[PDB]
Amino acid sequence: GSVVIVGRINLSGDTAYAQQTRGEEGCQETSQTGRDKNQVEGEVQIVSTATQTFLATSINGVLWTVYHGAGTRTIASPKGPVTQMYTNVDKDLVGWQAPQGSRSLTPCTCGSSDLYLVTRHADVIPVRRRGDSRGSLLSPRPISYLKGSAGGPLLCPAGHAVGIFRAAVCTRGVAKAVDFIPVESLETTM
Ligand SMILES: CCc1nc2ccc(OC)cc2nc1O[C@@H]1C[C@@H](C(=O)N[C@]2(C(=O)NS(=O)(=O)C3CC3)C[C@H]2CC)N(C(=O)[C@@H](NC(=O)OC(C)(C)C)C(C)(C)C)C1
Ligand SMILES: [Zn+2]
């Protein structure tokens, strides 16, 4: 089936919170047909397949997510399934054209290393950048807390996109750091 948008992380106000826009039955139906007529809003979408759920983030007019979540699948849209515009298994990255109604993040040009990871539960987690594709959690969390947030963004203090969350760096079940696709690699892929 297609990947289906089932909610979003609302970042528009003073408070970050998840919203569900489609339940599991409707999601299952929409995945089979590839036809999704629901209104899309925001920069960070919660998405699902038949078997998994994760995030997808709009940057530069593309809705980006991880290959390990989406594989080569289409995404459901008001006019039927939409094929990926980008697929890179080596970077664990896919992208589709961004849905009408979505808002896109701007790629960061700040050169700053104080970042913020947004999870599928609308937790905003500070992250110190530690390399091109790594950042440390200021406060370590069990894996559980981050599971299902691949595809979500790392943002700079100004709200620009710095990367897409890919993997957790763990020791005995605790995530001390994160691995992400840097926005420059998105821009190159482009
Ligand atoms: C580089 C990662 C990767 N690349 C892939 C490329 C292609 C591919 O093709 C099949 C598979 C890949 N798998 C991948 O990793 C897989 C997928 C990915 C994962 O689960 N991603 C998350 C997460 O939340 N995932 S998620 O729950 O949302 C899942 C629904 C998407 C964000 C994590 C939250 C806990 N993985 C790790 O994070 C592992 N850690 C990892 O390998 O650490 C390294 C890279 C530092 C060694 C865990 C599970 C031990 C924590 C293993
Ligand atoms: Zn920035």
Domain chopping of the chain, boundaries: 1-105, 106-190
Q: 3-class SS at 186?
A: helix
Whether 43 lines ligand 1, by a CB cut-off of 6 Å, is: no
CATH class entry, domain 1-105: mainly beta
What secondary structure does DSSP assign to 17-56, as a single string? EEEE-S-HHHHHHHHHH-B--SPP-BSEEEEE-SS-EEEE
* Cα–Cα distance measured from residue 156 to residue 49, given in angstroms and rounded to the nearest whole number: 29
Q: Is 144 helix (H, G, I), strand (E, B) or coil?
A: helix
Q: What is the resolution of this structure in A?
A: 1.6
Instruction: Please give the number of the atom of ligand 1 that sits closest to the Cα of 165.
Output: 32
Cα–Cα distances in angstroms (integers) from residue 128 to residues 90, 91, 120, 133, in the given order:
25, 21, 20, 11
CA of 168 relative to ligand 1 center, distance in Å:
7
Residue 52: count other Cβ atoms within 10 Å of its Cβ: 14
Residue type, 156: C
Name 21's Cβ contacts closer than 8 Å, sequence gap at least 6: 5, 6, 7, 8, 38, 39
> Which protein residue's CA is at the shortest distance from atom 45 of ligand 1?
167
The helix or strand, by DSSP H or E, that contains position 68, with its residue range, turns out to be helix 67-70
Report the nearest-CA residue for atom 21 of ligand 1: 167
Residue 120: CB atoms within 10 Å: 22
3, 65, 66, 145: residue to mutate for ligand 1 pocket, most atoms within 8 A of CB: 66
Say how many Å lie between the CA of residue 147 and the centre of ligand 1: 9
The CA–CA distances, whole Å, from 149 to 110, 112, 180 equal 24, 23, 11
For residue 104, the tally of other CB atoms under 10 A from its CB is 17
* Residue 12 DSSP symbol: S
Instruction: Determine the CATH number of domain 106-190.
Output: 2.40.10.10
Q: Same CATH topology for 1-105 and 106-190?
A: yes
Q: Which amino acid is residue 140, in one-letter code?
A: P
